[PDB]
Structures are given as structure tokens and as C-alpha cells.
Amino acid sequence: EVIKEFMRFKEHMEGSVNGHEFEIEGEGEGRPYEGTQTARLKVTKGGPLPFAWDILSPQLSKAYVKHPADIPDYLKLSFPEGFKWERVMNFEDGGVVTVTQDSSLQDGEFIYKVKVRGTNFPSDGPVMQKKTMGWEASSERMYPEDGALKGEMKMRLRLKDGGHYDAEVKTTYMAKKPVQLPGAYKTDIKLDITSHNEDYTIVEQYERAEGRHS
């Protein structure tokens, strides 16, 4: 089995949000079959970012999702070659983030290359004003479509005030080879920022995800 009970990953992210370019590198580790992982991230160009780290967090690892045996683990099955994913997040106030990402397994470690593009966030919004405080747990609706695996969910970012700032998120996950697509199901996910420096140029995150029938 190429995917061991303990697996590390290395990741590179580049992109821009509202004209601000940046780059981030990260290294993480986790238990793929347990659906858990952590990562140490750092801004390597463009720091400090003038927008909420929260919008980048979900872009930083689907090989780490616990699945019952009766649900094909399409994304795990896709390794070592890997899979690619593209996403769009439509924020309630007009902000948008589109992402393209490549995942592969090279020499016992996952390699992630991510490109993010965010635009149209109001300068007085919670994103550009950094007033968000992490995501509430989500439940992504997974389903096979067009020979790919799709994911649909509304995500809620906590607002420093006490409210929430929402996003309708749509993701397409496509294995590099036609590994077995599963039927429709749901994945409960929770991502936590467990540590960060004041200006978020150094940040640590944890995420637990588990697939279950809907």
C-alpha cells in the first residue's frame, strides 16, 4: 500500500487576493485512515498578507479523510499518481476565490501545489479587514458527476463580532487515472487554526474529516 497509516506532506501555494501576490510553503503530517492531520505553514513572499488567513486555510488535503469500507476512497485510491482539484468560493458579499491544485505522492510523501486567486473582496469587508475568526465545522455533499467527484457545501466563517460571514463552495476532484468513483455521501470536516504569529506569517492548522453515508 502506497498510503501508510502515517504520512507527511509538503505544500506550496501561490496566488493573489485583490491584487496582492504571495507565496506560502508548508509541511504537515497525519493519519490518512483516521482523517486527521496538522501542518506548519509560513508566508514566504508577500508577507504579511493584508487579508484574512481564513480564506487560504481550506486550500491547504483530501487524502486525509476517514472513509467506511463500503464507500470507495476515490482520492486515496488515486495515489501514487494523485489527483487534481478546482474550487470556487462565492462569498456573501461578492468576494470570490477560485483555486486549482495538484496532489501527488513522491517518495513516501504527498506533494501539493496550489494556486489561489481571490478578488472583489470589499475593502471594508471582514476579509480585507481581517475580522474573521475561523470556520465552523462543515458538511460537504459529495457526489459523482461527469466522471469526477464533486463537493458542494456552504461554509461559515466566524466574525470577530459574533456573527458569521458565509460562502457557497463548489469543488471538483479528479483522479489522474479513472479510480473507482463512490456514490453520493457526506464528509464532515472541521479545520482549526491551532497557532499563529500576530501577523499570520507563521500559522499551524489541524483538520479532521470523515466520510459517512447521507
Side-chain angles (χ1 to χ4, degrees), residues 155-160 162-194:
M155 298 179 63
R156 299 209 89 175
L157 248 179
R158 305 183 272 270
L159 247 21
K160 247 142 210 117
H164 292 96
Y165 167 60
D166 297 345
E168 303 287 353
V169 182
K170 184 61 178 283
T171 309
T172 294
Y173 308 86
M174 170 86 83
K176 279 140 174 188
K177 284 321 174 261
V179 301
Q180 180 181 24
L181 281 157
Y185 69 112
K186 252 136 185 302
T187 301
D188 303 320
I189 305 144
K190 184 162 185 20
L191 188 163
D192 296 321
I193 295 314
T194 64

Side-chain angles (χ1 to χ4, degrees), residues 23-44 46-112 114-130 132-138:
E23 289 199 0
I24 289 169
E25 273 190 340
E27 58 84 8
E29 67 213 83
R31 300 170 186 159
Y33 300 94
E34 288 328 311
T36 57
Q37 64 187 303
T38 56
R40 272 51 68 183
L41 299 319
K42 69 179 182 220
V43 180
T44 55
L49 316 155
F51 59 82
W53 168 274
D54 291 331
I55 57 164
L56 307 194
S57 77
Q59 337 306 339
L60 300 140
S61 180
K62 291 307 228 243
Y64 299 79
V65 176
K66 180 168 161 147
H67 283 67
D70 63 334
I71 302 187
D73 203 332
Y74 178 79
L75 309 178
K76 269 189 191 70
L77 287 162
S78 75
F79 289 95
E81 196 175 2
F83 65 91
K84 284 227 70 203
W85 65 264
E86 289 192 338
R87 170 175 294 159
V88 61
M89 308 185 75
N90 281 296
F91 293 85
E92 76 174 77
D93 63 354
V96 179
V97 171
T98 57
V99 180
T100 46
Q101 196 263 31
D102 190 284
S103 300
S104 44
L105 191 184
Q106 294 149 22
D107 195 32
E109 273 203 353
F110 291 117
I111 303 303
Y112 301 161
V114 198
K115 302 188 205 197
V116 177
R117 297 289 171 197
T119 192
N120 198 39
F121 286 94
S123 58
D124 43 283
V127 166
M128 307 303 304
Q129 300 284 349
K130 305 199 173 208
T132 72
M133 287 159 6
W135 302 93
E136 302 271 356
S138 297

Side-chain angles (χ1 to χ4, degrees), residues 2 4 6-9 105-110:
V2 332
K4 322 300 170 259
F6 176 75
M7 294 288 291
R8 280 179 183 280
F9 64 80
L105 191 184
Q106 294 149 22
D107 195 32
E109 273 203 353
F110 291 117

Side-chain angles (χ1 to χ4, degrees), residues 189-206:
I189 305 144
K190 184 162 185 20
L191 188 163
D192 296 321
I193 295 314
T194 64
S195 171
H196 63 87
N197 61 10
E198 159 153 308
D199 76 352
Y200 289 71
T201 47
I202 301 165
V203 181
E204 289 187 37
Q205 35 189 90
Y206 168 73

